[PDB]
Structure formats: structure tokens, C-alpha cells
Design a protein around this ligand. Structure first.
Ligand SMILES: [Mg+2]
Ligand SMILES: [Mg+2]
Ligand SMILES: [Mg+2]
Ligand SMILES: [Mg+2]
Ligand SMILES: [Mg+2]
Ligand SMILES: [Mg+2]
Ligand SMILES: [Mg+2]
Ligand SMILES: [Mg+2]
Ligand SMILES: [Mg+2]
Ligand SMILES: [Mg+2]
Ligand SMILES: [Mg+2]
Ligand SMILES: [Mg+2]
Ligand SMILES: [Mg+2]
Ligand SMILES: [Mg+2]
Ligand SMILES: [Mg+2]
Ligand SMILES: [Mg+2]
Ligand SMILES: [Mg+2]
Ligand SMILES: [Mg+2]
Ligand SMILES: [Mg+2]
Ligand SMILES: [Mg+2]
Ligand SMILES: [Mg+2]
Ligand SMILES: [Mg+2]
Ligand SMILES: [Mg+2]
Ligand SMILES: [Mg+2]
Length: 73
RNA sequence: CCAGCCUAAACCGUCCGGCUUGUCCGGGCGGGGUCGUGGGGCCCUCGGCAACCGAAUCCCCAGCCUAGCCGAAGCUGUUGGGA
């Protein structure tokens, strides 16, 4: 069972991270407690989004602060 | 006997719901697509088509079905209860 978890669990790993688990642990616990989600191709593709989103957002907030330093120095 | 066809998916637009604004997550609608010389999508170059095909869908008609109608040519005698 592949599931991207939405919470840092000492068991599995950190948020957003994808990891393998026994189906039971997922179907009967992680899933209902919302702690994690199915690594479905649909959701997985949407996870590639948040990465690119903030990979841009950060590589631009900092990218803009590259000119401010380019003048005060 | 005779005959071949429509979609799902990639792709684009829209509507509603969702987030952490992304050619992004889902749902419905429309466009796109449909085959084994493998085909389609998206990009570059040629018509930027009159045309050529065309129904298993509609519309009119013929025909046919459910009543009908026209239709040739004979008389006499005889037996017999009756020709
Ligand atoms: Mg489908
Ligand atoms: Mg598509
Ligand atoms: Mg669109
Ligand atoms: Mg859509
Ligand atoms: Mg709607
Ligand atoms: Mg909305
Ligand atoms: Mg959409
Ligand atoms: Mg469609
Ligand atoms: Mg078509
Ligand atoms: Mg079509
Ligand atoms: Mg084809
Ligand atoms: Mg080219
Ligand atoms: Mg052209
Ligand atoms: Mg052309
Ligand atoms: Mg023209
Ligand atoms: Mg006729
Ligand atoms: Mg007939
Ligand atoms: Mg009749
Ligand atoms: Mg008569
Ligand atoms: Mg008669
Ligand atoms: Mg006599
Ligand atoms: Mg007689
Ligand atoms: Mg007599
Ligand atoms: Mg007689």
C-alpha cells in the first residue's frame, strides 16, 4: 500500500512524504483518521503540484530579494 | 444474405464543488478521437475547399392490406315426381 501521509509519524515519516504500509493499517486507521491518503495516480499528480508550486514561490520570493541586495550593498 | 458503426483515453474550452493558485484535484457539458499499411494527441510545412460519398433518422410517393365491382355463350322436344 502506497500512501502519502499528512502528518509526521515516528512510525512512517514526515508530512507529504510517500511510504509503504500494510493495507490494514491504512484502511482501518490511517485513512479514517485522515492521517494519510491513497497514493492514487490522481492524488500523487496533485502532490507534484504543491512541490512545483512552492518550488516556484520560494524560488521567486528569494529571487525578488536578489535585486534588493543588488542595490543596498 | 450482405454493412457497417459509436465511444474510453491523450488534447482544448466551460460550469460547479476543492486548495497549498499549478497546461492543477474531482464532477458534469461541449469540441477532439476510434485502428493493425498500427492509430490517434500535440507541435512545422500544402488546399486555408468548392467537391466527392451519405444513412440503419426523418419527409413525400408508388405499391400492398382492411369493404367491393365488371364479367362471354341456349332454345325446342322427350322420359320423369322433378332434366
Ligand atoms: Mg470513461
Ligand atoms: Mg485528453
Ligand atoms: Mg481549459
Ligand atoms: Mg474539465
Ligand atoms: Mg454546474
Ligand atoms: Mg471553485
Ligand atoms: Mg478541470
Ligand atoms: Mg469528453
Ligand atoms: Mg468522430
Ligand atoms: Mg465526435
Ligand atoms: Mg485513424
Ligand atoms: Mg518543426
Ligand atoms: Mg495549411
Ligand atoms: Mg491542410
Ligand atoms: Mg474555402
Ligand atoms: Mg413505386
Ligand atoms: Mg409493394
Ligand atoms: Mg378489401
Ligand atoms: Mg356479376
Ligand atoms: Mg355469367
Ligand atoms: Mg312416353
Ligand atoms: Mg325421366
Ligand atoms: Mg312427361
Ligand atoms: Mg330440358
Amino acid at each position: 500500500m502506497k500512501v502519502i501521509l499528512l502528518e509526521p509519524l515516528e512510525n512512517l515519516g514526515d508530512v507529504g512524504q510517500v511510504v509503504d504500509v500494510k493495507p490494514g493499517y491504512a484502511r482501518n486507521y490511517l485513512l479514517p483518521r485522515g492521517l494519510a491518503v491513497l497514493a492514487t495516480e490522481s492524488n500523487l499528480k496533485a502532490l507534484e503540484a504543491r512541490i512545483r508550486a512552492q518550488a516556484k514561490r520560494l524560488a521567486e520570493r528569494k529571487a525578488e530579494a536578489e535585486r534588493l541586495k543588488e542595490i543596498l550593498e
